[PDB]
């Protein structure tokens, strides 16, 4: 999917986790976010100056999703252990990683 | 003032906002952070002592304080509207910006 579809998937499913009642909902949302993050990882940010694939800026972009996926996996482990409240708190910690990447385009 | 002293001003006024009870305290602390951020913006950080003021590194360093000041101005607006709770949440959300500059420059 394109970057915009991925970002909608991420934003939508973070809200799903926030209002979820059970682990199945949290796990399903986190699984969808993980796929969307790995999809977006291969895209190019539209406002980036040097879009050269090996530029530090492009590596910092790709690495942002590595960090995001690691955090998604942290939350997935908690949800996999039936720790719904804890997984939800872990998902909230994603937000600063989202915002970090966005700030490179502001 | 130097970066370390301005950073102390920012860190301490973050705590003043956290324990504040009214809009006057929050406004006073945010205004103090705004001033410290604009003073810090004048400085070349240690890891860039080698770099010109028109260098892209320094443009982005100064831009980071503009982002932070923009967010402080949003929190000020909330406090001037008497939304004391929302202003305090906004001040907390600043910490993500604090950490992002640190990753790239500290
Ligand atoms: C880079 C490493 C990113 C991470 C991590 C996240 N997002 Fe993102 N997002 C990214 C880019 C390059 C952009 C476009 C910026 C621009 O030039 O406009 C976005 C944008 C969004 C949006 C706005 C919708 C859109 O532009 O199509 C949303 C709602 C969004 N992103 C959500 C989001 C969330 C919830 C994230 C973490 C869980 C997240 N993004 C991470 C790049 C990156
Ligand atoms: C760049 C745009 C920055 C923003 C935004 C914020 N800070 Fe910062 N901070 C920055 C640098 C380059 C440094 C290193 C200075 C040095 O001489 O090494 C720092 C350091 C700090 C510190 C440590 C201070 C010390 O005496 O070692 C603190 C406590 C700190 N910064 C706090 C802080 C807060 C709370 C911020 C947002 C509200 C914030 N900083 C923003 C650069 C930047
Ligand atoms: Ni970054
Ligand atoms: Ni000093």
Swiss-Prot record, chains A, B:
Annotated residues for binding of heme b: 7, 102
Keyword annotations: Electron transport, Heme, Iron, Metal-binding, Periplasm, Signal, Transport
Note on cofactor: Binds 1 heme b (iron(II)-protoporphyrin IX) group per molecule.
Cofactor: heme b
Spans annotated as Disordered: 38-60
Compositional bias annotation for Basic and acidic residues: 47-60
Cellular component annotations (GO), alphabetically ordered: periplasmic space
A single GO BP: electron transport chain
Single Gene Ontology MF annotation: electron transfer activity
Major localisation: periplasm
Subcellular location field: Periplasm
Protein family: Belongs to the cytochrome b562 family.
Quaternary state and interactors: Monomer.
Described purpose of this protein according to its UniProt entry: Electron-transport protein of unknown function.
Name the record gives this protein: Soluble cytochrome b562
Organism expressing this protein natively: Escherichia coli
Name of the encoding gene: cybC
Span covered, complete protein: 23 to 128 of 128
